[PDB]
Amino acid sequence: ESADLRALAKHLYDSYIKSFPLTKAKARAILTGKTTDKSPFVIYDMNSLMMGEDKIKFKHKEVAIRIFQGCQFRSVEAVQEITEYAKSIPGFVNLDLNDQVTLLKYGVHEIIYTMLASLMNKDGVLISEGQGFMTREFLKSLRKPFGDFMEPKFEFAVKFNALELDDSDLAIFIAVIILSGDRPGLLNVKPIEDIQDNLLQALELQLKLNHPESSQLFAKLLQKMTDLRQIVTEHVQLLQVIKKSLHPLLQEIYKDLY
Amino acid sequence: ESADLRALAKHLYDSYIKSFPLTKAKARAILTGKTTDKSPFVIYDMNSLMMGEDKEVAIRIFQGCQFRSVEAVQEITEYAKSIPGFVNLDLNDQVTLLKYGVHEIIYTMLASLMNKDGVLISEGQGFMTREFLKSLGDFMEPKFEFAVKFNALELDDSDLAIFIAVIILSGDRPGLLNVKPIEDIQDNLLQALELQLKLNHPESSQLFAKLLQKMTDLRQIVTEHPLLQEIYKDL
Numbered sequence: 001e002s003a004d005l006r007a008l009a010k011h012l013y014d015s016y017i018k019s020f021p022l023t024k025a026k027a028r029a030i031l032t033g034k035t036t037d038k039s040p041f042v043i044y045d046m047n048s049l050m051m052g053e054d055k056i057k058f059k060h061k062e063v064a065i066r067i068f069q070g071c072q073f074r075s076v077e078a079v080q081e082i083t084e085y086a087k088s089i090p091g092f093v094n095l096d097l098n099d100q101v102t103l104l105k106y107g108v109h110e111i112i113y114t115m116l117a118s119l120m121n122k123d124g125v126l127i128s129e130g131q132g133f134m135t136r137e138f139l140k141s142l143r144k145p146f147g148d149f150m151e152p153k154f155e156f157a158v159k160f161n162a163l164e165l166d167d168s169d170l171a172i173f174i175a176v177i178i179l180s181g182d183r184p185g186l187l188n189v190k191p192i193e194d195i196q197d198n199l200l201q202a203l204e205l206q207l208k209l210n211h212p213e214s215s216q217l218f219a220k221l222l223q224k225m226t227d228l229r230q231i232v233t234e235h236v237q238l239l240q241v242i243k244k245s246l247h248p249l250l251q252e253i254y255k256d257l258y
Numbered sequence: 259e260s261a262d263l264r265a266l267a268k269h270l271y272d273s274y275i276k277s278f279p280l281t282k283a284k285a286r287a288i289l290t291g292k293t294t295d296k297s298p299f300v301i302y303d304m305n306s307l308m309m310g311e312d313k314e315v316a317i318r319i320f321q322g323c324q325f326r327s328v329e330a331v332q333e334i335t336e337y338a339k340s341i342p343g344f345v346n347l348d349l350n351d352q353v354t355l356l357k358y359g360v361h362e363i364i365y366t367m368l369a370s371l372m373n374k375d376g377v378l379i380s381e382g383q384g385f386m387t388r389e390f391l392k393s394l395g396d397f398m399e400p401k402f403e404f405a406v407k408f409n410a411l412e413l414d415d416s417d418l419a420i421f422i423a424v425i426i427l428s429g430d431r432p433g434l435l436n437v438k439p440i441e442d443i444q445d446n447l448l449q450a451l452e453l454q455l456k457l458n459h460p461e462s463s464q465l466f467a468k469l470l471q472k473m474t475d476l477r478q479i480v481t482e483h484p485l486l487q488e489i490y491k492d493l
């Protein structure tokens with residue numbers, strides 16, 4: 001069955017390519033300065049933060065807070081991308097609608113962090129679709145609860161990026177994360193795990209063929225999901241330190257994804 | 259290398275038997291009224307509890323359960339010594355791996371002594387029900403929910419021995435000095451488990467991943483709410 005595993009891999013990558021406008025390949029080309037196209041506007045200090053908000057578009061009233069809503073606007077945009085990609089996954093839209101919601105409900109945070117790692121090196125993050133680069137030192141230097149809440153994301157990213165996965169690897173990895181059969185409140189786990197079974201097989205082969213010099217990559221990738229679920233837990237906790245940010249209709253768009 | 263990987267598997271299993279006096283095989287013989295062993299005393303309520311230990315109750319149960327963690331770190335430590343390469347690692351790092359990896363192993367091995375209804379105590383001589391514990395009041399519910407999920411994998415002692423070695427030797431543990439020698443040991447512990455599951459469960463569909471995915475669920479129980487106070491010092 002090594003032929004349908006290749007065809008499954010490809011066509012998650014094909015849908016991945018169209019669901020997500022900014023890929024890892026493109027993020028690394030920009031980060032490394034590593035070819036033609038363009039250098040991003042760098043946010044290293046308060047004066048660059050304020051100049052970045054003119055030429056740079058921002059579809060999104062103190063400064064460190066103005067960085068939360070921006071990060072929150074953006075994560076909610078990402079949900080609709082992850083939601084579209086989920087639908088390209090063979091078997092997903094035949095699942096019970098309730099289960100589809102539960103898978104996304106719990107899956108989108110873990111996928112957001114995975115994808116946030118593609119835009120991060122140890123020095124900072126690509127923001128505003130590669131057009132910008134906020135430095136890491138500019139982020140530790142934010143106030144009170146804003147001083148961290150990005151810093152552990154970087155911690156995980158530097159470690160995650162060391163696996164040197166490409167977009168074709170991540171397409172399957174993300175699919176694996178969505179079709180996760182232990183989301184609280186799933187009504188029907190049989191097809192969920194039979195789809196995840198395929199994806200794991202497709203992933204195991206992809207890592208084999210794509211990183212043939214890298215012995216236990218499938219297993220080391222799976223261990224990362226234990227770091228992923230922990231980072232998600234302490235972010236949902238740091239957002240009950242940030243119920244202490246006004247809409248309200250924006251509290252009502254941007255409270256979840258969902 | 260599939261002779262190296264059988265040798266390693268069988269080495270860890272031997273050390274496992276020798277380190278842990280109550281195995282899962284023993285626990286399952288005791289739990290299912292199997293004949294080789296003797297039925298436990300059952301603690302379902304208050305004068306069962308009273309009659310079993312022949313100030314208050316809840317925190318005195320929490321004193322016992324906390325001390326069972328003591329011999330358990332005495333035993334996990336002894337096992338970790340037999341893991342090829344462990345004692346070669348930097349002294350500080352040996353400690354770092356033990357401190358963060360021990361509770362995840364406790365909960366793995368507590369799944370062996372549990373069913374849907376309760377837990378074995380005193381090397382399998384007693385049996386505390388889930389509801390007498392739910393009568394105190396929360397601290398055991400996640401253990402039981404993981405235990406029920408895990409025991410579905412139908413893992414036995416030879417599988418757990420290797421899987422537990424995989425836990426202890428993780429290079430993601432906060433503040434490891436020399437990460438690379440630790441990853442090197444896990445890599446061959448990883449392909450020894452993969453050979454163990456394909457050879458022991460020839461019919462288990464993608465069991466290897468299913469088991470490492472369960473490493474998530476273990477990490478989250480650990481986020482629960484004085485040789486213990488010195489393991490907890492920062493996590």
Ligand SMILES: COc1cccc(Cn2c(C(=O)O)c(Sc3ccccc3)c3cc(Cl)ccc32)c1
Pocket residue numbers: 043052066067069070071072074075078112113115116119125126127128129132134150
């Ligand atoms: C996984 O995709 C993303 C999810 C959330 C954010 C981002 C990039 N990004 C953005 C953005 O709006 O593009 C933002 S908001 C922003 C950036 C610069 C100036 C004002 C707002 C952001 C903030 C942090 Cl602390 C980290 C990453 C951030 C990408």
Ligand SMILES: COc1cccc(Cn2c(C(=O)O)c(Sc3ccccc3)c3cc(Cl)ccc32)c1
Pocket residue numbers: 310311319321322323324326327330364367368371377378379380381386391398
């Ligand atoms: C996996 O190794 C174990 C780690 C901790 C506990 C146990 C079994 N156990 C014990 C014990 O003393 O053997 C105990 S302590 C105990 C309980 C009643 C009377 C006397 C002691 C315990 C308590 C809970 Cl709430 C759950 C499991 C427990 C086993």
